[PDB]
Amino acid sequence: FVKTTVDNSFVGWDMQNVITLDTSFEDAKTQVQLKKIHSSVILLYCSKDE
Amino acid sequence: AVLILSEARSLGLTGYDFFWIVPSLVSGNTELIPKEFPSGLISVSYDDWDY
């Protein structure tokens, strides 16, 4: 839904990255994958504990 | 230097188009190259083996 809304409106949205960090993300995946996002707005989507 | 290069490779600054240059004291003995040194370290040093 986000990708459809972004690529269809008129304002002009520059969506930088889409990250899907799976597994228990103990220390490896989280740290190696979260270091690229250095934009100004982050749109989280997860359960409470995650 | 080893720590900084290892932390910078994670950030994504060590691709085909990133050139690192370091003085002699970073590579001051040779033949003991660590694991984290990339290929293309343009480093000046005292005469390697001709002297």
Swiss-Prot record, chain B:
Cellular localisation: Cell projection, Dendritic spine; Cell membrane; Synapse; Postsynaptic cell membrane
Disease in which the protein is involved: Epilepsy, focal, with speech disorder and with or without impaired intellectual development: An autosomal dominant, highly variable neurologic disorder. Features range from severe early-onset seizures associated with delayed psychomotor development, persistent speech difficulties, and intellectual disability to a more benign entity characterized by childhood onset of mild or asymptomatic seizures associated with transient speech difficulties followed by remission of seizures in adolescence and normal psychomotor development. Rare genetic variations in GRIN2A may be associated with susceptibility to schizophrenia, a severe psychiatric disorder characterized by hallucinations, delusions, disorganized speech and behavior, cognitive impairment, and social withdrawal.
Domain notes: Contains an N-terminal domain, a ligand-binding domain and a transmembrane domain. Agonist binding to the extracellular ligand-binding domains triggers channel gating. A hydrophobic region that gives rise to the prediction of a transmembrane span does not cross the membrane, but is part of a discontinuously helical region that dips into the membrane and is probably part of the pore and of the selectivity filter.
Family note: Belongs to the glutamate-gated ion channel (TC 1.A.10.1) family. NR2A/GRIN2A subfamily.
Biological role: Component of N-methyl-D-aspartate (NMDA) receptors (NMDARs) that function as heterotetrameric, ligand-gated cation channels with high calcium permeability and voltage-dependent block by Mg(2+). NMDARs participate in synaptic plasticity for learning and memory formation by contributing to the slow phase of excitatory postsynaptic current, long-term synaptic potentiation, and learning.
Assembly with partners or alone: Heterotetramer. Forms heterotetrameric channels composed of two GluN1/zeta subunits (GRIN1), and two identical GluN2/epsilon subunits (GRIN2A, GRIN2B, GRIN2C or GRIN2D) or GluN3 subunits (GRIN3A or GRIN3B) (in vitro). Can also form heterotetrameric channels that contain at least two GluN1 subunits and at least two different GluN2 subunits (or a combination of one GluN2 and one GluN3 subunits) (in vitro). In vivo, the subunit composition may depend on the expression levels of the different subunits. Found in a complex with GRIN1, GRIN3A and PPP2CB. Found in a complex with GRIN1 and GRIN3B.
Name the record gives this protein: Glutamate receptor ionotropic, NMDA 2A
Shown residues in whole-protein numbering: 236 to 286 of 1464
